[PDB]
Write a protein that binds this ligand. Sequence first.
Ligand SMILES: CCCCCCCCCCCCO[C@@H]1O[C@H](CO)[C@@H](O[C@H]2O[C@H](CO)[C@@H](O)[C@H](O)[C@H]2O)[C@H](O)[C@H]1O
Ligand SMILES: CCCCCCCCCCCCO[C@@H]1O[C@H](CO)[C@@H](O[C@H]2O[C@H](CO)[C@@H](O)[C@H](O)[C@H]2O)[C@H](O)[C@H]1O
Ligand SMILES: CCCCCCCCCCCCO[C@@H]1O[C@H](CO)[C@@H](O[C@H]2O[C@H](CO)[C@@H](O)[C@H](O)[C@H]2O)[C@H](O)[C@H]1O
Ligand SMILES: CCCCCCCCCCCCO[C@@H]1O[C@H](CO)[C@@H](O[C@H]2O[C@H](CO)[C@@H](O)[C@H](O)[C@H]2O)[C@H](O)[C@H]1O
Ligand SMILES: CCCCCCCCCCCCO[C@@H]1O[C@H](CO)[C@@H](O[C@H]2O[C@H](CO)[C@@H](O)[C@H](O)[C@H]2O)[C@H](O)[C@H]1O
Ligand SMILES: CCCCCCCCCCCCO[C@@H]1O[C@H](CO)[C@@H](O[C@H]2O[C@H](CO)[C@@H](O)[C@H](O)[C@H]2O)[C@H](O)[C@H]1O
Ligand SMILES: CC(C)=CCC/C(C)=C/CNCCN[C@H]1[C@@H]2C[C@H]3C[C@@H](C2)C[C@@H]1C3
Ligand SMILES: NC(=O)CN(CC(=O)O)CC(=O)O
Ligand SMILES: NC(=O)CN(CC(=O)O)CC(=O)O
Length: 900
Amino acid sequence: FQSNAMFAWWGRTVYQFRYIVIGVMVALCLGGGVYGISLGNHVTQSGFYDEGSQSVAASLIGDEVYGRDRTSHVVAILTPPDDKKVTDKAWQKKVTEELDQVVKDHEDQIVGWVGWLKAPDTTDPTVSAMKTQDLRHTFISIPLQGDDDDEILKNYQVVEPELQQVNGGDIRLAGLNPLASELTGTIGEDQKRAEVAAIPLVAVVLFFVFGTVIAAALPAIIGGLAIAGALGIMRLVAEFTPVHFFAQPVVTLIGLGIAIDYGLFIVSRFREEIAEGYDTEAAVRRTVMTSGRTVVFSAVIIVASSVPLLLFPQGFLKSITYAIIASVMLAAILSITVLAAALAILGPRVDALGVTTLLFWGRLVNVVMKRPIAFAAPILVVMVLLIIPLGQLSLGGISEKYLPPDNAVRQSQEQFDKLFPGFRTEPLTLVMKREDGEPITDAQIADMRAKALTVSGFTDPDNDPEKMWKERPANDSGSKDPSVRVIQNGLENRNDAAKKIDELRALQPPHGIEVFVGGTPALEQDSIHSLFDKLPLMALILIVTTTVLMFLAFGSVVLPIKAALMSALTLGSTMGILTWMFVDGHGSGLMNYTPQPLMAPMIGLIIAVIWGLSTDYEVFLVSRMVEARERGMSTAEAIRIGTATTGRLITGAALILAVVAGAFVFSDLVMMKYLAFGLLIALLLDATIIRMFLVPAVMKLLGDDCWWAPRWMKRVQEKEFNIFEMLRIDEGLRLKIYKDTEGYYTIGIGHLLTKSPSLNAAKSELDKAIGRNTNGVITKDEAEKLFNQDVDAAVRGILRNAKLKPVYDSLDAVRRAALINMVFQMGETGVAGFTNSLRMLQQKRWDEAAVNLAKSRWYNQTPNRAKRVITTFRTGTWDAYEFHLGGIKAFHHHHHHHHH
Ligand SMILES: CCCCCCCCCCCCO[C@@H]1O[C@H](CO)[C@@H](O[C@H]2O[C@H](CO)[C@@H](O)[C@H](O)[C@H]2O)[C@H](O)[C@H]1O
Ligand SMILES: CCCCCCCCCCCCO[C@@H]1O[C@H](CO)[C@@H](O[C@H]2O[C@H](CO)[C@@H](O)[C@H](O)[C@H]2O)[C@H](O)[C@H]1O
Ligand SMILES: CCCCCCCCCCCCO[C@@H]1O[C@H](CO)[C@@H](O[C@H]2O[C@H](CO)[C@@H](O)[C@H](O)[C@H]2O)[C@H](O)[C@H]1O
Ligand SMILES: CCCCCCCCCCCCO[C@@H]1O[C@H](CO)[C@@H](O[C@H]2O[C@H](CO)[C@@H](O)[C@H](O)[C@H]2O)[C@H](O)[C@H]1O
Ligand SMILES: CCCCCCCCCCCCO[C@@H]1O[C@H](CO)[C@@H](O[C@H]2O[C@H](CO)[C@@H](O)[C@H](O)[C@H]2O)[C@H](O)[C@H]1O
Ligand SMILES: CCCCCCCCCCCCO[C@@H]1O[C@H](CO)[C@@H](O[C@H]2O[C@H](CO)[C@@H](O)[C@H](O)[C@H]2O)[C@H](O)[C@H]1O
Ligand SMILES: CC(C)=CCC/C(C)=C/CNCCN[C@H]1[C@@H]2C[C@H]3C[C@@H](C2)C[C@@H]1C3
Ligand SMILES: NC(=O)CN(CC(=O)O)CC(=O)O
Ligand SMILES: NC(=O)CN(CC(=O)O)CC(=O)O
């Protein structure tokens, strides 16, 4: 619990079942990936509104009674080839027959085609308006089949290829479905751009991190298994709840980079351990206990940064939140299962194949350390003046402007609105529902119209307020229930939406009738309102949880307050820049996008994403500084320690992430660029300004005060392993007299009492040793003290031996215990026989000594104990004893049994 206890268990478990683990998980990830390629046909485009808003309710009631509008499904501009005019009866007949053929061949997809071209001899002003007055252009409407927008789009995409060939191909398709097909079509382009531009780029970066093919390929394989598995999970999620189109690229944009970053960290750690002298099995466990632990905790931070998005009612954000959680969790799991097992099978062979086969930063901190205010105050001000273009943001819905200005589908729509003005409308609606269920009378309608005319700001083309707020059209999909009537009118200024909606909702409905104010402006504004109405609580929950987790990771009261400061800074600065780029349009001409109002759900998402990004990177950096301090370093040093060995990893992690996000800034979908850029900025801001400058400078405000909590701080007693626990394993611990392998009476930790066959003689010796009537039984304490005096005796003899005193003096405390261990087992004169091996140890040639000692007869008679001691010589840690193989069936009394 709250301890490496379980990571230690899994670290050794994953090695032991390295074949089973690596087989099952790859099977599941590949199996899921195969199952996850059908996700593309089970995704939705809906989820940008508030399902519980009055505007959505108005739409449901409206569509129920009057029928959903299908006149906007497909709009098609027809233009006669040889500067001919639409009045040409011959041209009229060929095109008409072409249109009838498409409808005849696709009646499951198409309702029919409607337009002036169907009745050129009409007196209808609107129908006659479906042709330009130069008679060079005319448009038709092509209503499609389907009971929801996803089904309708699929029906469009079915008939689109043949529909595009009408009029010799000179037919321009616009409206909802051609635009929706183009907007959702951006997904595949971004995926393919990642698969071709981002993947080899990541491969190169990885190959410049490790000098080896295998070591560089492993993180890439993990990312690929993560994407496959995550998409399979999202496909499973689709069986229960709607999954948005935008969830698929998020898996690749965010999941892939994070997964590879995880793999990079763990493989890198595994190599450290190998180089430190630990064998494969131990290296695997130590990697999981440290890096695996860091990865899992990283996943928790990101999940905790994503969950608050579920407070938002937009299905768009919910799907994405599910996608992030599924990606990050799977990434963390894979890095400590498949990857660990792979390293457990490969071992040092992760560096077997190198480049041949397919072919004082450290004082810079000090500068700012000495000069904290020389760097902090300017940056602290600069990143605030970057927040000032965050006070100038606009919010809108989805339009053709989300596509680049040179996009053919966008331009077709823009030509339609140019050639045929007035046809495209976004009116506010007054949806009236009578509660009794009885018909709504003309008196009640005239009542509502009057109260609507009270509100100003609505269009009036016919210059007569009697012809304002006309009744919504009805089709054959409508129930025509008399208890529901809908009147509607458009705004003169669309930026008056939020205000005019309230005024309409301020009116008083007549005769007990529920009035629902709807329309696309209402849907957008209600969604905008819903998101900022809940943003504070989401922000509170976000900040609190991330701070609470940092209370646990740091053990400080100030540092989490400090990091919150930093994230809120790098957030507001980043979002201020994004607003400067996408709202004000700085960079628009260069990156070929249109300056426009943002989308409110993308703000909630980018807040969570930037926050979790800032928190995760600072936790890893700071947590280590903390470890150095506990290790005994100085405030200024602990910081130096921290920054320097997180350095190469953080930059290597930020870079790979930047590559992936960099592939997505080229997306034709403008909100995708907004997201990908938000990544790059906050990433760059943390990999440099925050980490290398602000943090250390804003860590010097004080020496020893940032580390402070009451006695509600980590105990970290550390059960500092000692020589007592060491030989307790090798020689046993018995509190009652027993016979060892030679049949001699022994007690405690291998302490010979006597060679007499008499038990009472041994009890005699024990009573004189402990200083009381023991009756053959001692306490653990008495055994420990007894053991100590034996250790002192062994040391005195070692220091008395001229063959052992030099090597003993040269050794660290841990390796000294290993030498004492040998003296206990075979005696000083025995240990002094290893003249060459002792010389190697004295020269700190750990590997050579370890190799040489294994060739001994001592290793032959007692391999398990010898390997334990030898490993201790190789690494200089207690690792060989803190985790050892069970058994130890034979106990034997040691040399240097001290007597009173
Ligand atoms: C772990 C890493 C890799 C992840 C890989 C994930 C594998 C995905 C699961 C394997 C395939 C599951 O198969 C799928 O399961 C669900 C069970 O609820 C079934 O779905 C069933 O339950 C839902 C519950 O409302 C019903 O709406 C549905 O009509 C019904 O058929 C699917 O018909 C089946 O096709
Ligand atoms: C992502 C952004 C999406 C952008 C969406 C842009 C789509 C624009 C859709 C334009 C809709 C044009 O739809 C067109 O409207 C007129 C009415 O106004 C219809 O005309 C219909 O109503 C008129 C009178 O109101 C009747 O006299 C006529 O008999 C009838 O056909 C046309 O049959 C239809 O083709
Ligand atoms: C990256 C993949 C993620 C998927 C991206 C989303 C693509 C699908 C949504 C594109 C269109 C947005 O959703 C759509 O917006 C337009 C206006 O905003 C609405 O269209 C409304 O306004 C237009 C004029 O502007 C009217 O002609 C039309 O009668 C009316 O319905 C649609 O009712 C709504 O369905
Ligand atoms: C060890 C294996 C390593 C690789 C494993 C990863 C497998 C998954 C990678 C590809 C993601 C799934 O496959 C993906 O599915 C959808 C539908 O099938 C495709 O995309 C399709 O629908 C999307 C939106 O729904 C459209 O934008 C696109 O025009 C269309 O082609 C993607 O272009 C394809 O990339
Ligand atoms: C601390 C633990 C961290 C790990 C948490 C893992 C995440 C799992 C939490 C799922 C929350 C429950 O998910 C529940 O179903 C859907 C999912 O969109 C939500 O969606 C709700 O509104 C949508 C509109 O889009 C409806 O289609 C849906 O019928 C409705 O349930 C609910 O508001 C939510 O209550
Ligand atoms: C992690 C920290 C998180 C930060 C905490 C965030 C709390 C900030 C709450 C501010 C509330 C802003 O409130 C919101 O402002 C914008 C304008 O700016 C309004 O938006 C309205 O005005 C703008 C400009 O005229 C229009 O483009 C937009 O279509 C319209 O809806 C919203 O209707 C309103 O709800
Ligand atoms: C998607 C939402 C809600 C937030 C963004 C999620 C993102 C990118 C966090 C940044 N952190 C991911 C990789 N971080 C890397 C990992 C390896 C190593 C040690 C840890 C873990 C810290 C660094 C260096
Ligand atoms: N482990 C040892 O020192 C064995 N030595 C024995 C010695 O140094 O006297 C022989 C050797 O190094 O080959
Ligand atoms: N492990 C035992 O029971 C006996 N041991 C001997 C010992 O621990 O001293 C054999 C060995 O370690 O190879």
